[PDB]
């Protein structure tokens, strides 16, 4: 629309002709290639050799400058926020992701409730985990919680355990967190 | 009682405060509406 | 925060556990609430949950109630949410009289349902409602059209205002040169032959 | 890169000469010393007196302006955090 006006405005047709203007000279510097160069040149805050004459093209240059004043000013405002790195999302996020992979070994404390949970489970996702855990039972089923915590640190291993004991570990080691929501709900009760 | 079938907790129920949107003339907000006139009366003044 | 103010009235269902909780509480914060609630007991202690929910909507009122019933309401009304964490922890239990052969049989029967996940399947059947369009999820706030918006409006209105100056520049020229050269309406169309030329010229 | 393209593009060859050349005074004003000055002059947000004319040099002018638009904007947005020096916060504040 700058090129349409500059080929319609009867004042943009100026003569370069510096000495003494005779006749038969005048020509627009706004070719259609040039009008992108004013549009890109004003948008990139650097300014062009082009500068309009002829008030109808000044208003296009006036409103496009106030357009690109706000867009550059708004872009620099949020740019302090978005220059923060995000750490990698874990390849597991729930029981469905952790069951459908063989890269990360996973088990629980043997002779515990979690081993007993998947052993007598009939959920199709959770039966896949006990189908996994029963095969390499010597390797992935550790003997205690402390051996389960240590093999997460010293290897590539996701460990199935209680929620409240995670609440003590993750407040102690800040490199190691809870993945996903609670599978079931249980309770510590004083046995009699 | 039997042994529970659902876990509870006392909590507070209250209305959400309305998130009034920054309407599409939001970029005029960082200056007062008389300062936008005072800049406009400057560039109409200093140019004169 | 809710104890240290008098702007927002607050109560609970009368003859319930929450009223019983603050009545026999010895926490210094929670005793302040029952010191509040016992005075204007007729006003802030509603008779049911449904009267408690409605007075949050129809007035300035924060309501003390169970967590799981909030989980059904906030999935139904998206203008009204849970404030803060859980005060205590309790449980819905199937009540039996003082000494019954049905206490231990249900205790077996409840534990059978949760390892089969059926207590979780029944809770998702009822507490899942409209889905409730959730939250802005407070993070960095990349600018959409809804909050820049008007700089395209003044750009569109600026180009509309520009082209009437362009015909204003056209007619003021077409009235000026036609004083001596040509006539009024035709010399406008003469310059239309100039402008529609695809080349450079005089 | 701009000096390579300016000598290679046959449209940056113009004659300065605003008055009736009649044979040949065609020049190619981008030297080495002018090509760095367009690069430095756009890097410091000031802008030179020299502007590309052929489209073969406009994209070089176009991308380099967009490059310096992001460098300077990322410089200003980050430096607000580094002048506002977050003070000494030795991690003991109370008995807790
Ligand atoms: C993101 C990308 C999207 C696409 C980009 C946008 C589209 C691309 C735009 C393509 C065309 C625009 C490029 C500049 C002009 C081309 C010049 C040229 O090729 O060499 C010519 C030198 O002769 C001239 O230079 C004559 C100058 C013409 C006026 C310049 C603007 C009018 C173009 C109006 C453009 C359409 C507007 C509506 C019509 C008014 C050689 O002459 P020619 O080859 O033999 O041509 C016939 C000769 N004639 C013209 C002299 C009679
Ligand atoms: C540095 C440059 C300075 C230039 C000097 C000129 C400055 C003269 C300006 C003077 C005052 C203009 C702004 C008014 C003050 C804003 C406060 C307000 O209450 O308005 C509000 C009403 O919305 C409006 O009515 C805004 C005015 C509409 C016209 C905007 C023209 C843009 C300026 C043309 C310059 C381009 C050309 C420039 C030259 C080529 C806007 O806020 P809101 O978002 O609606 O909030 C409610 C939303 N809600 C209802 C959902 C909750
Ligand atoms: C030499 C010295 C000068 C001599 C003295 C001369 C006398 C001058 C004395 C002036 C005295 C001041 C009187 C006005 C006060 C307004 C403030 C206000 O509160 O109202 C509103 C201003 O919001 C607007 O609507 C502004 C109008 C549109 C903005 C575009 C104007 C400039 C356009 C581009 C300029 C191109 C620049 C070209 C440069 C070459 C804000 O509140 P609101 O909520 O938005 O109200 C809505 C009102 N409405 C419903 C009707 C919409
Ligand atoms: C070439 C292409 C043309 C095609 C496109 C044309 C299309 C444009 C049509 C029409 C554009 C012109 C009228 C504006 C109405 C737009 C409609 C609108 O959105 O409502 C507006 C009301 O109205 C206003 O608030 C605008 C106030 C004046 C600003 C516009 C002129 C600038 C004044 C200075 C002169 C500058 C020039 C001189 C500078 C030197 C915005 O209020 P809203 O309703 O709440 O917004 C809805 C958003 N919502 C749904 C989220 C709630
Ligand atoms: C242009 C000619 C072709 C060149 C092609 C070869 C050049 C390459 C040379 C070096 C790079 C080699 C390394 C990367 C190779 C692949 C590229 C890549 O990264 O893909 C990117 C897309 O790529 C794009 O879409 C960006 C292209 C920008 C186009 C600019 C046009 C400007 C013209 C306008 C000028 C206006 C002028 C104004 C005046 C009028 C994204 O991929 P990714 O995010 O990195 O993937 C990560 C995946 N991961 C997340 C799993 C880890
Ligand atoms: C201030 C005014 C300046 C105007 C310039 C505007 C230029 C065009 C603007 C935007 C065009 C593309 C917008 C999509 C970018 C989103 C991020 C993204 O996808 O990155 C992804 C890969 O990277 C990509 O896939 C993008 C590939 C193209 C990059 C180069 C574009 C700049 C053109 C060069 C020319 C320079 C200028 C030409 C003139 C000289 C990274 O993965 P992700 O982030 O995890 O995925 C999220 C994807 N999502 C957000 C879409 C959901
Ligand atoms: C969100 O909550 C209400 C809903 O609009 C707003 O406050 C009430 O608004 C109605 C009209 O919609 C008035 O009749 C009431 O008198 C208002 N009450 C109060 C206490 O203000 C409230 O302003 C909205 N916005 C925010 C930010 O809370
Ligand atoms: C060059 C001209 C056209 C610019 C616009 C007019 C100027 C001279 C006028 C318009 C409104 C005026 C301001 C109105 C209010 C105050 C607050 C007062 O406590 C100190 C003076 C001060 C800050 C004035 C300074 C001068 C001022 C900015
Ligand atoms: C200015 C011209 C040349 C190019 C841009 C086109 C303009 C007119 C169009 C393109 C995208 C459009 C916006 C797209 C989405 C919305 C959100 C809606 O809730 C209100 C209208 C609004 C805000 C539109 C307003 C007009 C708009 C800004
Ligand atoms: C909407 C209209 C009526 C109001 C604006 C009037 C416009 C179209 C006209 C009226 C008089 C015109 C001016 C008359 C004389 C000259 C001197 C010349 O060397 C450059 C153009 C210039 C500066 C004109 C620019 C456009 C102009 C200002
Ligand atoms: O294993 S239980 O004794 N009975 C089953 N349930 C729940 C249904 C959630 C709960 C919930 C919380 C507990 F502390 C104990 C139990
Ligand atoms: N704490 C569990 C054992 C460990 C586990 O299963 O995670 C139990 O009481 O049986
Ligand atoms: N649900 C509670 C009553 C309501 C309340 O105290 O909040 C109970 O079982 O006693």
UniProtKB/Swiss-Prot annotation, chain C:
Q: What post-translational modification does the entry describe? A: Sumoylation mediates kainate receptor-mediated endocytosis and regulates synaptic transmission. Sumoylation is enhanced by PIAS3 and desumoylated by SENP1. Ubiquitinated. Ubiquitination regulates the GRIK2 levels at the synapse by leading kainate receptor degradation through proteasome.
Per the UniProt record, which residue ranges are transmembrane?
148-168
Tell me the residue numbers annotated for binding L-glutamate.
17-18, 66
Q: In which tissues is it expressed?
A: Highest expression is found in the olfactory lobe, piriform cortex, dentate gyrus, hippocampus, granular cell layer of the cerebellum, and in caudate-putamen.
Coiled-coil annotated spans: none
Q: What is the effect of changing residue 79 to Q?
A: Loss of glycosylation
Q: Which residues lie on this side of the membrane: Extracellular?
A: 1-147
Please give the positions of the paired cysteines in each disulfide bond: 78-132
Glycosylated residues are 79
Name where it's found: Cell membrane; Postsynaptic cell membrane
Give the Phosphoserine positions (modified residues).
Answer: 174, 196
The miscellaneous comment for this protein is: The postsynaptic actions of Glu are mediated by a variety of receptors that are named according to their selective agonists. This receptor binds domoate > kainate > quisqualate > glutamate. It does not bind AMPA without coexpression with GRIK5.
This molecule's function is given as: Ionotropic glutamate receptor that functions as a cation-permeable ligand-gated ion channel, gated by L-glutamate and the glutamatergic agonist kainic acid. L-glutamate acts as an excitatory neurotransmitter at many synapses in the central nervous system. Binding of the excitatory neurotransmitter L-glutamate induces a conformation change, leading to the opening of the cation channel, and thereby converts the chemical signal to an electrical impulse. The receptor then desensitizes rapidly and enters a transient inactive state, characterized by the presence of bound agonist. Independent of its ionotropic glutamate receptor activity, acts as a thermoreceptor conferring sensitivity to cold temperatures. Functions in dorsal root ganglion neurons.
Q: How does it assemble?
A: Homotetramer and heterotetramer with GRIK5. Tetramers may be formed by the dimerization of dimers. Assembles into a kainate-gated homomeric channel that does not bind AMPA. Can form functional heteromeric receptors with GRIK4 and GRIK5. Can form functional heteromeric receptors with GRIK3. Interacts with DLG4. Interacts with NETO2. Interacts (via C-terminus) with KLHL17 (via kelch repeats); the interaction targets GRIK2 for degradation via ubiquitin-proteasome pathway.
UniProt family annotation:
Belongs to the glutamate-gated ion channel (TC 1.A.10.1) family. GRIK2 subfamily.
| Name of protein | Glutamate receptor ionotropic, kainate 2
Tell me which species this is from. Rattus norvegicus
Shown segment, full-protein numbering: 673 to 874 of 908
């Amino acid at each position: 629309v700058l090129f349409v006006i500059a080929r319609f405005s009867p004042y943009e047709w100026y003569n370069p002709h510096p000495c003494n203007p005779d006749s038969d000279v005048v020509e627009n510097n706004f070719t259609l290639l040039n009008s992108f160069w004013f549009g890109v040149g004003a948008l990139m805050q650097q300014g062009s050799e082009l500068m309009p004459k002829a008030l109808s093209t000044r208003i296009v240059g006036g409103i496009w400058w106030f357009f690109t004043l706000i867009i550059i000013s708004s872009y620099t405002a949020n740019l302090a926020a978005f220059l923060t790195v995000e750490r990698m999302e874990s390849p597991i996020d729930s029981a469905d992701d952790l069951a459908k992979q063989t890269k990360i070994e996973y088990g629980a404390v043997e002779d515990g409730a979690t081993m007993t949970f998947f052993k007598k489970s009939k959920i199709s996702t959770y039966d896949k985990m006990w189908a996994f855990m029963s095969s390499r039972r010597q390797s992935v089923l550790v003997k205690s919680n402390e051996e389960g915590i240590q093999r997460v640190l010293t290897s590539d291993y996701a460990f199935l355990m209680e929620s409240t004991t995670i609440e003590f570990v993750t407040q102690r080691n800040c490199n190691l967190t809870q993945i996903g929501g609670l599978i079931d709900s249980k309770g510590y009760g004083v046995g009699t | 009682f039997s042994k529970p079938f659902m876990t509870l907790g006392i909590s507070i129920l209250y209305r959400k405060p309305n998130g009034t949107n920054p309407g599409v003339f939001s970029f005029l907000n960082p200056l007062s509406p008389d300062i936008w006139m005072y800049v406009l009366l400057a560039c109409l003044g200093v140019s004169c | 925060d809710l104890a240290k103010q008098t702007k927002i009235e607050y109560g609970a269902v009368e003859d319930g556990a929450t009223m019983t909780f603050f009545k026999k509480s010895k926490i210094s914060t929670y005793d302040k609430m029952w010191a509040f609630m016992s005075s204007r007991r007729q006003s802030v202690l509603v008779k049911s949950n449904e009267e408690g929910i409605q007075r949050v909507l129809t007035s300035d009122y924060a309501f003390l109630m169970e967590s799981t019933t909030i989980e059904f309401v906030t999935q139904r009304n998206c203008n009204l949410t849970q404030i803060g964490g859980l005060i205590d922890s309790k449980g819905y239990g199937v009540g039996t009289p003082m000494g019954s052969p049905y206490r231990d049989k249900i205790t077996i029967a409840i534990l059978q349902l949760q390892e089969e996940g059926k207590l979780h399947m029944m809770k998702e059947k009822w507490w899942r409602g409209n889905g409730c369009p959730e939250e802005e999820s407070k993070e960095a706030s990349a600018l959409g059209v809804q909050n820049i918006g008007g700089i395209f409006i003044v750009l569109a209105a600026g180009l509309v205002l520009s082209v009437f100056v362009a015909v204003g520049e056209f007619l003021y020229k077409s009235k000026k040169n036609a004083q001596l050269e040509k006539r009024s309406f035709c010399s406008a169309m003469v310059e239309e032959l100039r402008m529609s030329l695809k080349c450079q010229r005089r």
